[PDB]
Curated annotation (Swiss-Prot):
The chain holds residues 372 to 527 of 809 of the full protein. Residues 31-156 form the GGDEF domain. This is Uncharacterized signaling protein CC_0091. It comes from the Bacteria. It is found in: Cell membrane.
Length: 156
């Protein structure tokens, strides 16, 4: 019910619940809150060239990498397909602190993944939304981060 079966990350349901709660937390605490939408550059080609189990291997390894990097109170979810979300709760300069994690995420998702005695191309794109300027509700931040992902994929 609260986890993505394939990867063990949060699912859409639990993401939305935890993001809504995080907004209330940070409104009171003064912590920074950012939503990062991530997708994989070569998921379609893995599925096309090596079948559905190859794309799955990409998803499983992405999740493993995200579980290594994202610790409470931050959290990670897979929505569906190759679309992932990371919610960062942190301190300090909000645009900087989110940009710093974003950079680390891109780096960690760059390395290929072994599959069936071959290596599959990884690489990711991401978009960032910051509370409250990019939205004051979970849904507003979700949507804005997805738009930011679109913009990032168009511009690089």
């Amino acid at each position: 019910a609260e986890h993505d079966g394939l990867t063990g990350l949060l699912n859409r349901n639990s993401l939305q619940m935890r993001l809504a709660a995080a907004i209330d937390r940070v409104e009171a605490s003064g912590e920074s809150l950012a939503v990062i939408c991530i997708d994989l550059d070569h998921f379609k080609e893995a599925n096309d060239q090596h079948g559905h189990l190859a794309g799955d291997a990409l998803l499983v390894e992405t999740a493993r990498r995200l579980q290594s990097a994202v610790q409470a109170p931050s959290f990670a979810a897979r929505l569906g397909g190759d679309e992932f979300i990371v919610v960062q709760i942190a301190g300090g300069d909000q645009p900087a602190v989110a940009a710093e994690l974003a950079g680390r995420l891109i780096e960690m998702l760059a390395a290929p993944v072994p599959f069936d005695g071959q290596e599959l191309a990884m690489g990711s794109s991401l978009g960032v939304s910051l509370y409250p300027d990019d939205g004051r509700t979970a849904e507003a931040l979700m949507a804005n981060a997805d738009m930011a992902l679109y913009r990032a994929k168009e511009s690089g």
